Structure formats: C-alpha cells, structure tokens
C-alpha cells in the first residue's frame, strides 16, 4: 500500500532498456572523444551552492537538515561538484575532459519531460580557453544526439555572453549591462511583456527594436557583423567555432541572439540543441563558464561543457520511434517430460560462456506456458530439452521470431545458436 | 580562497577511481544479464514508512531522513529491497518468475568511525516467485560468477546455513527460544571461548550440544557430514544437498556449511549464504538468502524471494589487494601537430578513427611536441598521430607506438586502416 513519492519514477525492465541505451550511447561517444568518467557525492552542504552566478538551480533544491543539524541538499546539478574536484588536481596536465551521468534532483512540479529526479549526462573540458574546446563539446553533443537516432530533429543554436554583453552596450550604456535575464524569457513570455520589461529597464525604442529583431528567429553569423558590431573579436570566434564544427561534420549550426541559458555562470559561448518539431526548446545545452572555478576556490580554470537529461531524451526516442538495438541474443531453455535441472544448468553455462544471455525454466509449468513465458520475455531462441529426444542426444531449438524449429545434436547446440 | 569540502563519509571518484567502479558495474551487470536477470531502477527517495515493516526504529535511525511538506517522513534509500518489493507488488501483469537486478547508490547516516562511507554503490540480484532449490542455486551461482569474472576466483568460499536447519538443531538441544542461542552464536567471533561456553550453558544446553556448537562454529562442514553430525535426515538437509548438487552443475564446488552464519535469521525464511574471504580480512564479501515473508507483510500478496547484495567498497579493496588487471574496451589515439596545421584536418581524421571503433583525443592547446607526448602518455594513449606541416605536403603523417616508442611515416590514405591493424 505504501506508494512512491509523487514526481519520482520507477524503472521496470522495459523502462531500463531505454535508459541503458541512453547511458551506453552517451558514455561511448564521450569516451570516443577522449572524455573520462567521474562521479561525486549525491548529497552536499547547501552552502556549497551559495555562489554568485550559481543561484539558478538553488531555486528548486531538495534540501533539508541532516540529523546533525547542518543544511544539506541532494545535488541539483553536477557542475559545482565537478569544479571542486577539478581545482583539487593541480597535478593533472591540461586539458581535463571529464563526463558524468549522475542522478540530480529538483523539487519542481512534474510535467511531460520532467520529474523531481532524473539522470543527467555531463561533459566538460577544463583548462583550454580555445575555440577548439567550444567546438569539441558541441560536436560531442551532436554525436550523441545522432547515435541516439535523433539526427534530424535538432538544430544547434549558439550565442555568446560577450557578443550579447557588448551589443547591449554598443548602443545603450545603461549600467544594467546584464538585461540577460530579460532576453532569457523571450521564448517564455508574451512579446508585449518582453518589450516593456526591457523598456522598463531603461532602453530606447531603437534599442528595444533591434533587441527584439535580433531575438526573432535564428540568423546567420556572417550577417551579425553587419546588423551590429563591425567585426568584434567574439564574432570572429563564433565564426571560427562554426568552421571547426563543419570539420567534425556538424553543419547548419545557427546564431541565435535569444540563446542565453538560465544558469548565470556562463561567460562565453552558450548553446542548445533546439527541437525542430517545437516540443522542447532545449533538448540539451551548455556553454563556457570561465569564472566558476575562481569563485569557488580562487583557482582560475577555463571551462566549457553541457548537460543532457534522460527524461526529455526518452520522450524523443519514443516520439521518433527509435529502434533500441539489443547487444546479445537471449536463449530460453525449456523442459518437457522428466528432465534434470542440472543438465539444463550445464548447457546454460556453456551458452553463456560464448556470449549469450540464458534464462532457465525453474517453474513447474507446461511447455505451452513455457513458450508463452519465453516470448513474453523476448527470448530469441528456445532450446527445448525433451526426456525422450535427450535419450537420442537431441534437443529442439525454436526460433522465437521466425517460428522455425529443428532438432539439434547436443554437441552442435552451442555452434548452431551462435550461427542463429 | 577557501572551499566548502564534501560531507565527511562521502567519496569523490576521479577518472582512475571510476576505472575500477566501471569494471565492477560492467562485470556485475553482464553476469546478471547472462543469467537472464533484467535491470531495474527506482527512486533514491522513499517514504520512511516503507522501511518500518522490515526494520525497527532502532535501525531506522541510521537513515538520511527528514520531514516532508505534509509532515510526512521521507529518506534517502538505505537499501534496495523494499523499493524492489514495492515494484513487484505494484504491477500485477508481471509474469513469473522475475529475475531483477539493480545497482544504485544507497545512503546511511553513520559516523566515519567504522571504516565505511555514508554513500556507496549497492548491487542487488533477486528471483521473485519461485520457492525451489533451483532458485537458491541460481542466485548463488550468479554471485560466484560475478566474483570469478571480477578476477576474485580463488579468494572466496561460499558458506551456507539455514533458518529451518538452525531451528531443528537448536530445538533439539533446548526448549527455550532458539533466537536467544542464535545471539550467542552471533557473538562467537567477539567474546572468549571460555565466555562462549558459559553463555551456551546458561541457555540450558548440555555439554552435549555445547560441544557440537563450539565445534561447528570453529570449522565449516560439508553438506554430507550434517545428516550424521546432527543425527537426523530432515527435508531441510536434503534441500541443501539438492542445492549443492545444482551448484555443481553450474561449476560451483567446495560449498561449505557454516553453522555460525546467523545474522538476519529473523529476516530470512530459508537458505542464507555468504562469500567468505580466505585471507580472512572480510567475513562476508557479499551475501543474502531467501526471504519469502517480506512481500506479504508489505503488500499482503505472497511472494517467494531469494537474492544477494554486494557493496562496491569491499570489492574495490579486494581488486587492489589481489592486484587484478582491468581490461580496456578500446584502443586510444592522441592526435597533435607541430608547425602550422589546421585543427580541421585533425578533427576530420579523429572522426574517421572514432567511426572505426577507436577512442580519440585531439590536442587543443598550444604547446611543444615534448609536452604533447608527455600528455599522450599521461592519458595512456596507445598511439600518437603527429601532423607536421612539411610532412603533410608529402601526404604523410608520423605515427608512434606509445609503448614501443618507435614511429613510422604513414600516408594519410592509410592512417585509419593502419591503426586498426596495429595492436600495440
């Protein structure tokens, strides 16, 4: 009768087939780009997040007072824990390419694509302030989205905190230099409120006008110099990043002045994989945050990376009807008539030692129920031991898929299956 | 500047650390799945009420618990079973039997005193829906398989006991409550041999049984000896012989009967087992047993259950102790340049190498060749591809075997195929 806290999920086998696929694809891709896995505690002291620029996720922390009187919280994100670890390894030659895939928590109201607990992949490069670093992490994100079977549903949209901190300064020197909070909601709120929020910030008509025009849709990077800022340095960097992206095979990336990102520790490039169908604005996203390390430890460490939650990916995988591949072939071993479990165990052992997943019948059920069960668990083959056929050193192998059956010599069972 | 450290009792896992953890996860998962078990997961937070059925307020004090909005107590899960059981009894379309395994984190609010951690990866494998020898054996076989595949074969010994067995043997020596004696037996490795006897003799046990208990706790016995040592041939001893026989067909031999395994006997309803460390450093590397009554108490629905648990910490110490060599899935390649060379040409080839099953790390920082090779070595790359502008004009690139130290020129057109064939 005791139920699970609402907002949390249970993962039955079929649900985990999907999650595992997400874990495998993310991990294999990251390692292919040279990233190495790390992990950190799931609980931290709340004071860890009391940092200027890292106050966005502190808004929904699953915090509480341990029985020791101190305030703690389930981690809402992985970045600060990762940074604390980075600044503790001055022995490691740069760059540092680390990735993680921990659970993170957030006390928010559930909805299509979000729970209070989820698996979040993270990949970050520490130590390099180069365009190559910005491009590599974005290339890794695309690679993952592609290998997941989502290659045609997203668009890579980029921008930069420098490009957007000078534009709204190359016209309006209004000290509220970071109207960034306003632009972040451009796609959330209505156009009228957006125009007056920025207007009540102390921006002239021409300013509000261009800012609105710049936010409207995605544009080319090359035209950016034109429509504003005659070839600054950050614009040239974005161009370089675009070119570098093409070399990895990543194309159609687009500039979008409305791409800001919620987290406030971003200082350079910011990006998101936009869902072309319009269901999710950010399937994944990240950027460069060259000041977090200093703020937390006093050591300056350039950083660029991104995050990807499992919930939204699960939805897309289903929506786009992706086919989750199956690693090993599974064999279900049945029994009809009087047959010792021992001999079945012996052969299951032999099949396993040759790379196959084998499930043995242990229930006192008939052959009809056995095959029903075999099909219910998705076995690829059914090896049926029959008391009489065993006398003649024969066993029946059924192809659960085709429906085909054949008798097979005991000493040809292993090889016959391996050849399907 | 100063830093807020992580909570005492918790661990950070650096790349080198995760190399070990990944091998444990991978080995456990593949073995479990090879036996037909299927992975599941569940919330890391549950209502504290979920644990009250199987544990008392005393044990429930070591949980990372707290009060929820509606004044409801919730906790970071201290173990996996109650959650797993709740899932078994929350969906009624589930076939039978159910072979499920999980490997999430679990938390325990305990002081860093007893060399442990407040958080660790806990692996659990259980068979639900079958009260048979076959099930008892499969679970134990799976545990052995995992220990052997971890490179820990030869250091552990499977030791089994049984509640029904202990009751028959104790009941035949005294009429008082059996558990009062299980407690003493439970103190066998803590008190003195002289004090042990006194306690056994205070519970109404003659020199007769007192002698058999002391002997039995001093050494393990074969399943055979039991029928005679206890002078009885009950159905329970045959059940264990039946299990031993089934284990043999799985390749699991030298199973021992250990009378002293009594912890949890109030929880378990049938067989219980542990993987004992020969080097006598850890009494139980992993373990479990049958607990056919938990499901009923939790849902009202009767559900036989057998399984075992295994922590990452102790496995981690054993791997180091036995100096186990951990394999590397793929070959690693580092690509760098000397002289002016476009980053794009390096990206192009790393993509081609990755699409061919290799892990590739491209140099993205400005630094001399010597420092680059030092870096390649630090990350354990197997090969380094050196792009030199002059050499590129001639269509060649230098490739060095990071282990041999040698290097050959290779045509761009053959870099991929060349590395693919090279095996260090």
UniProtKB/Swiss-Prot annotation, chain A:
SUPFAM superfamilies: Class II aaRS ABD-related, Class II aaRS and biotin synthetases
UniProt cross-references to Gene3D superfamilies, sorted A to Z: 3.30.240.30, Anticodon-binding domain (3.40.50.800), Bira Bifunctional Protein, Domain 2 (3.30.930.10)
GO CC annotation: cytoplasm
UniProt keyword annotation of Ligase present: yes
Keyword set includes Cytoplasm: yes
Coiled-coil regions, chain positions: none
EC number of this enzyme: 6.1.1.21
Compartment(s): Cytoplasm
Pfam families: HGTP_anticodon, tRNA-synt_His
UniProt keyword list: Aminoacyl-tRNA synthetase, ATP-binding, Cytoplasm, Ligase, Nucleotide-binding, Protein biosynthesis
NCBIfam families named among the record's database cross-references: hisS
Protein name: Histidine--tRNA ligase
The encoding gene: hisS
């Amino acid at each position: 009768q005791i139920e699970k806290i609402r907002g949390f999920r249970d993962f039955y086998p079929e649900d985990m087939d999907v999650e595992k696929f997400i874990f495998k694809t993310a991990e294999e891709a990251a390692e292919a780009f040279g990233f190495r896995r790390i992990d950190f505690p799931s609980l931290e002291y709340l004071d860890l997040y009391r940092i200027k620029s890292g106050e966005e996720l502190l808004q929904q922390t699953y915090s509480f007072v341990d029985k020791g009187g101190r305030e703690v919280t389930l981690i809402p994100e992985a970045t600060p824990s990762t940074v604390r670890m980075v600044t503790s390894r001055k022995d490691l030659q740069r760059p540092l390419r680390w990735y993680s895939f921990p659970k993170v928590w957030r006390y928010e109201e559930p909805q299509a694509g979000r729970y209070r607990e989820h698996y979040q992949f993270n990949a970050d490069i520490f130590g390099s302030d180069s365009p190559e670093a910005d491009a590599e992490v974005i290339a890794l994100a695309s690679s993952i989205l592609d290998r997941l079977g989502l290659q045609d549903i997203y668009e890579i949209r980029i921008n930069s905190r420098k490009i957007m901190e000078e534009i709204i300064g190359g016209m309006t020197s209004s000290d509220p230099f970071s109207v960034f909070s306003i632009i972040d909601r451009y796609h959330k709120i209505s156009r009228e409120e957006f125009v007056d929020q920025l207007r009540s910030a102390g921006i002239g008509e021409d300013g509000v006008s261009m800012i609105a025009d710049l936010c409207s849709g995605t544009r080319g990077i090359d035209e950016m110099a034109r429509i504003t800022g005659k070839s600054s340095e950050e614009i040239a960097r974005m161009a370089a990043v675009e070119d570098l992206l093409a070399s990895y095979g990543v194309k159609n990336v687009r500039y979008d002045f409305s791409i800001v990102r919620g987290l406030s520790y971003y200082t350079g490039i910011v990006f998101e994989a936009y869902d072309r169908s319009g269901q999710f604005r950010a399937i994944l996203g990240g950027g460069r945050y060259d000041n977090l390390a200093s703020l937390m430890s006093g050591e300056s460490v350039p950083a660029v990376g991104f995050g990807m939650g499992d919930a939204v990916i699960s939805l897309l995988l289903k929506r786009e009807n992706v086919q989750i591949p199956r690693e090993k072939k599974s064999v279900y071993i049945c029994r009809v008539g009087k047959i010792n479990s021992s001999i079945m165990n012996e052969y299951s052992r032999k099949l396993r030692e040759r790379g196959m997943n084998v499930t043995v019948e242990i229930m006192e059920r008939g052959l009809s129920a056995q095959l029903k069960y075999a099909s219910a668990i998705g076995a690829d083959f059914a090896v049926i031991f029959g008391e009489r056929d065993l006398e003649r050193g024969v066993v029946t192998i059924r192809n659960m898929y085709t429906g085909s059956q054949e008798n097979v010599g005991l000493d040809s069972v292993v090889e016959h299956l391996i050849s399907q």
